[PDB]
Design a protein around this ligand. Sequence first.
Ligand SMILES: *[C@@H]1O[C@H](CO)[C@@H](O)[C@H](O)[C@H]1NC(C)=O
Ligand SMILES: *[C@@H]1O[C@H](CO)[C@@H](O)[C@H](O)[C@H]1NC(C)=O
Ligand SMILES: *[C@@H]1O[C@H](CO)[C@@H](O)[C@H](O)[C@H]1NC(C)=O
Ligand SMILES: *[C@@H]1O[C@H](CO)[C@@H](O)[C@H](O)[C@H]1NC(C)=O
Ligand SMILES: N[C@@H](Cn1oc(=O)[nH]c1=O)C(=O)O
Ligand SMILES: N[C@@H](Cn1oc(=O)[nH]c1=O)C(=O)O
Lengths: 791, 793, 123, 123
Amino acid sequence: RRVVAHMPGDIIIGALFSVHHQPTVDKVHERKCGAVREQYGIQRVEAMLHTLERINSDPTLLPNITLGCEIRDSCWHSAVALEQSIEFIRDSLISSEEEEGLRSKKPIVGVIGPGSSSVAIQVQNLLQLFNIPQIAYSATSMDLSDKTLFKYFMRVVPSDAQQARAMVDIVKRYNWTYVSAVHTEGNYGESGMEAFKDMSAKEGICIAHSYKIYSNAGEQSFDKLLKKLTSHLPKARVVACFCEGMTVRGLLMAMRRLGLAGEFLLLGSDGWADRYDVTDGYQREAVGGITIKLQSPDVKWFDDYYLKLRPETNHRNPWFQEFWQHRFQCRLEGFPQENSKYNKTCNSSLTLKTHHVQDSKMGFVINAIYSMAYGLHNMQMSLCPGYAGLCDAMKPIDGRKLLESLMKTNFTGVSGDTILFDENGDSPGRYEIMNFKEMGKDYFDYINVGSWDNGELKMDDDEVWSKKSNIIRSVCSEPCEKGQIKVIRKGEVSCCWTCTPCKENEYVFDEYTCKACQLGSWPTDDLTGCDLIPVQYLRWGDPEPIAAVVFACLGLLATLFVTVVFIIYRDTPVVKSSSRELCYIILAGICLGYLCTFCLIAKPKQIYCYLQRIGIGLSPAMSYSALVTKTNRIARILAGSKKKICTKKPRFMSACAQLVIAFILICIQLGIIVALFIMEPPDIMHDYPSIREVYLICNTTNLGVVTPLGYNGLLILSCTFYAFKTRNVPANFNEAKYIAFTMYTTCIIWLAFVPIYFGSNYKIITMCFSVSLSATVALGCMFVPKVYIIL
Amino acid sequence: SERRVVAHMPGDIIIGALFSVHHQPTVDKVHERKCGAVREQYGIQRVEAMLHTLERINSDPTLLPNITLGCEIRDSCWHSAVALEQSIEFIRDSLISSEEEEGLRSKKPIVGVIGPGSSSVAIQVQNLLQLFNIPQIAYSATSMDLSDKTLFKYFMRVVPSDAQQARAMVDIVKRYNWTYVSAVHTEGNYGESGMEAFKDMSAKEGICIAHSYKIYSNAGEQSFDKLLKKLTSHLPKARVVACFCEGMTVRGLLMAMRRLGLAGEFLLLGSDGWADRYDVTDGYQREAVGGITIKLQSPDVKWFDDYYLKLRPETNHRNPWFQEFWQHRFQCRLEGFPQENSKYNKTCNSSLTLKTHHVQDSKMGFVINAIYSMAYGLHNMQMSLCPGYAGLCDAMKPIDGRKLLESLMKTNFTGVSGDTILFDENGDSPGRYEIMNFKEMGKDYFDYINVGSWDNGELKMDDDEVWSKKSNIIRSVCSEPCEKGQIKVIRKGEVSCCWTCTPCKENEYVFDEYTCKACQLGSWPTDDLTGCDLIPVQYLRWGDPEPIAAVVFACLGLLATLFVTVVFIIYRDTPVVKSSSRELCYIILAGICLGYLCTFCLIAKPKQIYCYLQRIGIGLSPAMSYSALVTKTNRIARILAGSKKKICTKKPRFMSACAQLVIAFILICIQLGIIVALFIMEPPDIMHDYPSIREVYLICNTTNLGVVTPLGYNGLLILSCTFYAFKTRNVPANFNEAKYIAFTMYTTCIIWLAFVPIYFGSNYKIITMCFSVSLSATVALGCMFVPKVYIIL
Amino acid sequence: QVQLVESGGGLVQAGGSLRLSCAASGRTFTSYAMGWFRQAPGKERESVAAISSSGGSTHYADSVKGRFTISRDNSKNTVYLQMNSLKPEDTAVYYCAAAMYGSRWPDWEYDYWGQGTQVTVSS
Amino acid sequence: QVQLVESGGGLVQAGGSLRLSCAASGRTFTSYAMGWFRQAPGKERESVAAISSSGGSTHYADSVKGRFTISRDNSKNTVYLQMNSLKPEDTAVYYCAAAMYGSRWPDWEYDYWGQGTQVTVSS
Ligand SMILES: *[C@@H]1O[C@H](CO)[C@@H](O)[C@H](O)[C@H]1NC(C)=O
Ligand SMILES: *[C@@H]1O[C@H](CO)[C@@H](O)[C@H](O)[C@H]1NC(C)=O
Ligand SMILES: *[C@@H]1O[C@H](CO)[C@@H](O)[C@H](O)[C@H]1NC(C)=O
Ligand SMILES: *[C@@H]1O[C@H](CO)[C@@H](O)[C@H](O)[C@H]1NC(C)=O
Ligand SMILES: N[C@@H](Cn1oc(=O)[nH]c1=O)C(=O)O
Ligand SMILES: N[C@@H](Cn1oc(=O)[nH]c1=O)C(=O)O
């Protein structure tokens, strides 16, 4: 049997305070509670007793009304506090069985507590069957807002549904990406971790592996947790804990028992906010640890009341003797609670203020007790207006009217704060964030950092680490994005990706794929768009073909040097004796060849491709139409009159008409080139030999240059047959010998042009090279010995 | 101030029960805790089963003689608060027994309860029960978080956990190609634990889940149609919904499927929440067609068949709900019966029976198994503590619950199907499963039909039984299996089954399902793009057929060499050859024949000695092909610049024509020493070429200067022999031999000018090489030997 | 366990009116039908009237059709009987009895009774 | 509440032995220390013997130090006092008392009492 801490009165208010530690394994079926708890236990008890001292002395709050109370232990465990809840409603059960035939106490009008989530969820299920409203002080789990399911439950603290938001904002602000997370079993940590991993994916924060563990785990079943957390090193450096205090202390104990001191940071919820006892003895393994806290100020009343409490004076608290035993480790000689296991009997000069740690959440307890008090006060003001004390409207007290009073309470807190709540029994509050770090050498301390309210996360980054180079960011794959390296995930976790560079044909179209560009379009420097590369237009000429351009200039100078003594100075009797149109057509074809040389190094526009097609088809046609007239003028004397005897005269009876006959062969190639102009217009075309290499050409076919060459090739053999025996005919200073030598020189490069143009990759300077080579020797072997010998 | 109605039977030993008599309360009624209408097949059927079971046990001389087993039955209504009220109604006597006792008799305390029939309500009830040592044996609490005997000491069930139902559903969706499923689970920790086990065992099998959904079984339609609006957004991607929901939730889904025109839209898989329940399908049965579900296997009970049909409302005097059962299932009032329910009209005939549309319950054999388990547990307590007395002696007065637990954990007996009923150290009795399907047997005749069973992974089913067709409903697969040995798989990062397809390049091969590696230089990917095979070189030993014309042209050059040497070497009647030096024409024929020999020594695989032979034919054969000509070419130089024509005051020759030929022999080895130095500075070895990725060649180690170096000396020798034979073109020596020599050099120099761009610009330059060699060798004999020999014929 | 208390009896004139009351001490009163009995001195205990558990279906003997009016209250767990046309052969010892597990009325099963009451109708 | 029952009184020669028994009601006996008193007729009541709540720390008056032996039982919720070296001035009305919120012995603030017993020691 447990021990109730009762105070008599007219109106009884129950309580559930965690006096002792929760039972370890192989003791939970016995339900034997462990040692006492100094700061969640008897401190809360003396707080409640002094609060009822203050309320029973207030003439404002409930005059002519005495508020009794009962306090039963909870021991953080579902079954223990469920036993004590049965101990509450035992009177309400027997009040319906002794009543009909066949007085103990007054029934409890409303409880306060307990101080976990899951135990409170267990206790309400008994309480809502007897209309007994519950006001909590630390039940913060977000599955307590369901007033459809939980009608008679209230708390003066906000839900942890925004603690997950604040922890998400903290790990958002410090570049965290790939975290670990443990949560204690029972639906505080379950609901908190559920909200956290629901709000992590909205912020894209990957989680390594969620872990659940009881707060009663032995070390053989506890060291597996650090063995599983070790397998994310140095990948996951942070552990987002929702665990309660003994679980975090178990983690620190296992970190010391595995040599992992100072290994990695861990973030916690309010389970170890100001609790020095979860760090004492293990404090080197918790250094740098950041956690949050539901914000609460200090209570000055309890400071001066609580230090003045002596074990020889306190006659209403059953656990104060064992408190005095345990926190000082001594026995007492005459006191009734001996605990003679402790030696070294205490001095009578001891006090409480030595190493006094004021509780963090105990202002909320006083807020809850005041909430019950103002609720009963509002019941009095709403049902019994004209009487001081309990009249016959509250005999007995209905719990539903008490709920309607309690849901609509407005008053001022112990810090003067307006205490009120929604239609869910959740009073809003603010937070504070601390860090556990080395203040002095062998002097470790919690220290405030910053607050949080509705997303307004205000902190101090230089306060933490005293350094802007912090602990290793829990990021799986490093940010290898350089505008060139894509990101490929393996499919398991969206933050453990692989890095891969993209090709020079490829650009970063997206963070997960690289698109290739178009034909010839080239990716830019950050690989986002497909820029272009300009053509090699070559108007001013490449400098080694500039030598060929100056060579064609020298060909024009040789043309001038011939025409200065051939066209104007006509003292030569041989030119006027024969037809002047012979040498005129020779000079015309040669000058048009050297003119079409310079009409090739240009941007290939429409009319410029027309000019180059003229220079490619008609200029070799007219360059040979230059020669062929005077070449086959000798044919009408050779095959016609005396040398080759034939019985026909294929000529006319006039040398001018013989020149008309020689004029016939000119337009035959011109008609075919005009037909090629009709069958193909001279237009611009682009070339892309490589991806980088960009050119602009004309629409040139393979047969487009063979077609002026296919007719001119047979004409070579025609003029060879027409001037075969003439090489031994000494006509006009051996002119036919130099003509045969000229044709012999000429035909070789026309043989050579085809593989040197088809095999090359440019064939355009080869073209003008071939034109000037065809035009040079025909004048060099004919005009210089004809003119210079008659000088 | 509402009170329920206990269904009690007196006896010496009281056994409680929690049976779901009524439906669970809807919203805006749960705070009043007013239960709804009755439940025909989870309710009063179970009640009459328990009452007839205690009839059979109270008549058995074997089980507990001299011992009467009373019972109390209280409603549960599937709800935590209602059954928690009834649990308080159980332990009310045990509470007052510790307060009336010390100064300051109602009933006997309950020794053990049976039920209830959910998971979460049972989890609520045990927390009261383990405080008073009262053991609980369940019949449908199947959730896997009930094996924690550290936490739940006084709890038992005769059914297996749902931790293997998730395994069986995973095996079902594994067997029918399912990949991207949807899943809803009811709130409360039956569906929570089941869906947790399912989505824990899905990723082990790689089965992606679209979105898990939770919903209460009390959801109104305004908060229920959002569930189908969220399930519609996976169409036709997710075609299957793996339900762990209980029966009213599945019926709510079918009601919403009818109320949105989504009849026959998509299949849904369920757990045992709607296994044999016709009532969750009645009225909505067209929207559930083709639906597959599982069932915890149980046979029929023949006893309850004959007992239950013989139950009349004018006879049953121990069941408080049987009148309202008779009211509700037949929709009538009764005139003289005490429970009127006058809201119903059309008063029932007195000829009615129960067997019309009788549906035997699926799980009610387990109820009888649980009651027998309590009976054999008390029997083993009697045999272990009170051996020599028939009845309750003073060892069980009162009964301890811990001794009852030690008895109950070690129970072995035979089931109603003769099955050995026993369990582990966790209170979980093993069993087997059956799988059914809800499909159209007859027109307007829909029925559950058995398919197959399951035990320890041995999933035996019948695929042709389902759909009557091997072309089934659309497989819930997100991205189609586009793997063709050529198309890689790229996931977007969200879900590992919704990937994108991408073909890989011809340089690329499938090294892995998520990346394509490129091959090496010239190595080519195979047909399924797994390994990098090779492509052979163009060795060209037998020759390409258009260079075969050049090979036959070199054969004709050898034939011309034979036609010259047949009248130059043997038939030596020519006075001009014996008058001059025969070694002149001998070196000419030697250089020419070695040129035409090195032509054929080029079309080969480039080995080490073969590259040596081709380097010989490339460097020394043009050297010796000109060393052929240059001796007789500059033999005339010692007469031209020496004696009379070009007067010089020195004699750069010797006093013997044989010694003049020795002087002409000097210029031969000068190129040979430099080519030997190039052999030292570079050995003739094989090299590969890769112009394209596909194009593979094998060449010799050839430098650009390696052929210019035998040409750089030979180019200046052209101008040297031109200066040495400039005026000789007008010197009529030996039938105008110097004229044909100048014409020969004029013919010769043009192709040596032409070779450099036609070799450097081409992409093969190897048939150009032998073409140039034969062109250099042809005209030097065609313009010199034919007029010299034919004119003296 | 519900016990019944009859009240309202005594002398009344002929043709008058009277209202008997049957209080029910206990819970679950909504789960019971109610029945009435009377017994003349010397005669047997005859059945009088009945009401169902949900109300609505009331019942009367053929001798008292239209004259006696039954009523119930589930707020206070009490049934009544307003009587009319009071005659000297109605001088009897009235009884109030609760019921459950019945058949066609009059064949019900009555588990409880009350202390009874006495009415004498004079002339 | 916890009630106390003294037993074991009667006549004895001096120098003998006797064993008093203090039976206790209630169920929270493990959370109480126990105290003893006696009062001779015509004299004052004196604090005699004491034990702590967890046992171990027992207490004896120096008039009875070493002669009386206290003991307790937490299984049956009963303390005892085996007395030795009996003397005729031990004739008194023995009392058994309990307390929870005490100070140094003999200041324990006893909140319970018993019926008592009568021992007379003759010569
Ligand atoms: C990391 O966080 C800082 C501020 O907390 C921010 O300036 C920086 O951009 C973050 N790093 C990256 C890669 O976004
Ligand atoms: C509490 O708030 C309500 C409005 O919500 C206001 O009417 C009332 O005056 C407030 N009470 C006090 C004491 O400020
Ligand atoms: C689909 O399942 C069948 C058998 O159920 C199996 O033969 C087939 O290989 C599966 N499909 C794929 C793509 O593996
Ligand atoms: C039940 O099983 C145990 C072993 O587990 C065996 O010893 C015992 O004989 C069995 N009982 C029956 C009735 O078969
Ligand atoms: N307030 C916490 C309870 N709690 O756990 C601790 O470790 N300390 C502490 O107060 C909760 O919401 O569950
Ligand atoms: N056995 C189920 C309970 N249940 O839900 C139904 O819809 N039917 C049914 O039996 C469970 O384990 O929770």
